[PDB]
Amino acid sequence: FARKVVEENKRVIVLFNGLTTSKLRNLLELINHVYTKVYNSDDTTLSEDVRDELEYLKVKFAYESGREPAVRTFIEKTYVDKLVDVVLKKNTKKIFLDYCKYFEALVAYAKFYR
Amino acid sequence: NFARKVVEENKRIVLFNGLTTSKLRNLLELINHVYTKVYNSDDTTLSEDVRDELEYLKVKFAYESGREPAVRTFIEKTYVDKLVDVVLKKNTKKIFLDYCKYFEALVAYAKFYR
Amino acid sequence: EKVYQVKLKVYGPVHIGSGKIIRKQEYIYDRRKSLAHIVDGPNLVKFLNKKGKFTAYLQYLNTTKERADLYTFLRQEQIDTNDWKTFVLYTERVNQGKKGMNDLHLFVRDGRGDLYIPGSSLKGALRTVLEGAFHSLSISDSLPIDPKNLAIYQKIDINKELKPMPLYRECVNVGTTVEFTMKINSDDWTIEKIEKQIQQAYLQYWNKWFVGMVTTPGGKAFIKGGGLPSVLPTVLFLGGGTGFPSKTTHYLQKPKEQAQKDIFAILQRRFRNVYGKMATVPKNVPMVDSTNKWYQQGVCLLEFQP
Amino acid sequence: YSKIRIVGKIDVLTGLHIGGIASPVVRDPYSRLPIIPGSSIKGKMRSLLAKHNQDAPEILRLFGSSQKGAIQSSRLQISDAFFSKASQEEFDKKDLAYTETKFENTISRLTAVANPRQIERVTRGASFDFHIIYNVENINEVMADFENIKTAIHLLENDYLGGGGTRGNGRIRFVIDSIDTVVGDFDSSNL
RNA sequence: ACGAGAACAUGCGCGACAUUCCGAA
């Protein structure tokens, strides 16, 4: 699915209405910082501290959407905002790692199509 | 945490006549000033001077409420002053951090919706 | 590269905007004394709790939402005069032209809390003087000035008559010398070139706009009161609100009449409420103190010494 | 081979900004205090010394060269200048934050419209503990190189450091606690 | 009374040299 959304919003190169890795570096730095927290803990379920921090990730997602319009279009089309909801709903490490793999595949295809 | 539903209901595109980017900023710059002060203290519980700065924080809340009725309607809906009363009673850093992360939440969602 | 010491002579009050405006609840103001006492946040609240009037102040805020003056609250509670001065930061003289005051603009202050004038204020004012790579032109922030010199001044609009404005701004009083350090490169800019350019900039500004101010009867009253100092060399207008025509490339790069009609055209586009409805070019565009001698806002003089 | 360790304090005279609010100043993540990166210092002194990769041979040996076929190690190792503990306690004595905010109207003359902007600067009076290491490969060139180090520091005391200094940003003053040889037999008092 | 039996894929080796988050207001 990650390859599809990048394909659909790839325009001639303008991606996600002008999204670059510099626009996403604030969000992804938080995402991989959260990734190392989940990676280290050997728990089948997300930690309570991680859950509150992921809620702050949701807040930062909206903050970056308001700041950079390109990031806003990137989030809505991807549903990465909605994916941060379901991982908190399931509250499992395995679902979250699938979400991080989804975001990593997202920026990977985003760079591939640029 | 619950800021998204709060700003969605209060939104009237602009939040209100008085909740512009500059009228609100004055409040979040005091929030910022205290936020750095607690950040640098690096203590488990808020200090007396931290509480003293918090004391003026709700005083400025009513200050802006009187000057602009739009700020008053927003403050009473968020019950943000109530959280200012709430944080002093617990007198702990992590609680102040949650309140200020909530503080960044309202402004972030306000920017996202507009 | 040579280092010049810069001296500013404050012939007129200078107010650099810091983006902070405080209403009457954040500082005491005595109408009879015409004096404003700046009050900080935490000190007022902690003292209010000690005297037990914190509940009373909140009640006073609720009774009058539109305006709840801090001075009237102090008068009705009859708190001690020294108690009022305990939480005061400093004392500033008020020069009102109106009686109370609605808003008070704050002169820019550094972290330490003392008055200083940024090097970007000089950089912006000097650039407009020359206009009509600037990497060589290097300035530095001034040394702090004494807090006593800071005082509240009132904007005055002169359209064939003197008219006070409700706005107030924090400005440095007259008779002040502040110091800068400026480094120049002998190739791009020269000390003789900049001082000559400032003198020409003030002269063209004078004969194109200020003389038009003098001709109107309102300008004559301003002159007779000493508003234009007899000293006015190098003249600049650092403070905000000193006037739109001051430090403009339109006057230097265009003839007197062509620049004036362009100033009128741009003013009517920006201000459609008043200037836009005006269908004719005026003869002078734009049409717009405790001490006995009047002063013109922003008036100042530089002097560069190697 | 000798190592001479220059420990001192760089006291900042104006609003210093190194922005890594339009640009917040760089901060050490561990303490969240402002920091002067050692690369900011080293780049500024190297550029000013060159003015006063292809540079003068004196500069190339002083700050390092990467020329193909001839690589010279940097005799100067400017380290990050962290926020001084003494200055931080001095700031804490007041109700003062370590970083101020500076505003600029940014008026465009053609349209007479000003675009506001904010710059986060370390407040005037802040001090930073700078660490400088000089590596001694040629003994006879130490005195000459240290003379050029004085030239670089003197240029810095007249110029700015980081941010837009043409408008009064980043002006600094250099004081030296001690210049002593930490490894080897080199005489510290000569320098 | 096993094409057996003995036998370290082992020793030396900086992910390193130059690099102002800077110009403009």
Curated annotation (Swiss-Prot), chain A:
Recorded coiled-coil stretches: none
Gene Ontology annotations of biological process type: defense response to virus
Keywords attached to this entry: Antiviral defense, RNA-binding
One MF annotation (Gene Ontology) recorded for this entry: RNA binding
Domain of life: Bacteria
Keyword match RNA-binding: yes
Pfam families per the UniProt record, alphabetical: Csm2_III-A
Family that this chain belongs to: Belongs to the CRISPR-associated Csm2 family.
Miscellaneous: Encoded in a type III-A CRISPR locus.
Role played: CRISPR (clustered regularly interspaced short palindromic repeat) is an adaptive immune system that provides protection against mobile genetic elements (viruses, transposable elements and conjugative plasmids). CRISPR clusters contain spacers, sequences complementary to antecedent mobile elements, and target invading nucleic acids. CRISPR clusters are transcribed and processed into CRISPR RNA (crRNA).
Quaternary structure and interacting proteins, as annotated: Part of the Csm effector complex that includes Cas10, Csm2, Csm3, Csm4 and Csm5.
Protein name (record): CRISPR system Cms protein Csm2
Species for this entry: Enterococcus italicus (strain DSM 15952 / CCUG 50447 / LMG 22039 / TP 1.5)
UniProtKB/Swiss-Prot annotation, chain C:
Keyword annotations from UniProtKB, A to Z: Antiviral defense, RNA-binding
A Gene Ontology BP annotation from the UniProt entry: defense response to virus
Molecular function per GO: RNA binding
InterPro entries on file: CRISPR-assoc_Csm5, RAMP_III_fam
The keyword RNA-binding belongs to this UniProt entry's keyword annotation: yes
Any single Pfam family the record assigns to this protein: RAMPs
Chain's role: CRISPR (clustered regularly interspaced short palindromic repeat) is an adaptive immune system that provides protection against mobile genetic elements (viruses, transposable elements and conjugative plasmids). CRISPR clusters contain spacers, sequences complementary to antecedent mobile elements, and target invading nucleic acids. CRISPR clusters are transcribed and processed into CRISPR RNA (crRNA). This subunit might be involved in maturation of a crRNA intermediate to its mature form.
UniProt cross-references to PANTHER family, sorted A to Z: CRISPR SYSTEM CMS PROTEIN CSM5 (PTHR38007:SF1)
Similarity section: Belongs to the CRISPR-associated Csm5 family.
More about this protein: Encoded in a type III-A CRISPR locus.
NCBIfam families in the cross-refs: cas_TM1807_csm5
Subunit structure: Part of the Csm effector complex that includes Cas10, Csm2, Csm3, Csm4 and Csm5.
Record-given protein name: CRISPR system Cms protein Csm5
Annotated organism of origin: Enterococcus italicus (strain DSM 15952 / CCUG 50447 / LMG 22039 / TP 1.5)
Swiss-Prot record, chain D:
Example of a GO MF term: endonuclease activity
Enzyme Commission number, as recorded: 3.1.-.-
Keyword entries, A-Z: Antiviral defense, Endonuclease, Hydrolase, Nuclease, RNA-binding
GO BP: any one term: defense response to virus
InterPro entries, A to Z: CRISPR-assoc_RAMP_Csm3, CRISPR_Csm3_endoribonuclease, RAMP_III_fam
Entry keyword annotation includes Signal: no
EC top class, as a word: hydrolase
Cited function: CRISPR (clustered regularly interspaced short palindromic repeat) is an adaptive immune system that provides protection against mobile genetic elements (viruses, transposable elements and conjugative plasmids). CRISPR clusters contain spacers, sequences complementary to antecedent mobile elements, and target invading nucleic acids. CRISPR clusters are transcribed and processed into CRISPR RNA (crRNA). This subunit has the target ssRNA endonuclease activity; it cleaves multiple sites in the target RNA at 6 nucleotide intervals.
Family: Belongs to the CRISPR-associated Csm3 family.
Subunit structure, interactors included: Part of the Csm effector complex that includes Cas10, Csm2, Csm3, Csm4 and Csm5.
Additional comment: Encoded in a type III-A CRISPR locus.
UniProt-recorded name of the protein: CRISPR system Cms endoribonuclease Csm3
Source organism (scientific name): Enterococcus italicus (strain DSM 15952 / CCUG 50447 / LMG 22039 / TP 1.5)
Encoding gene, per UniProt annotation: csm3
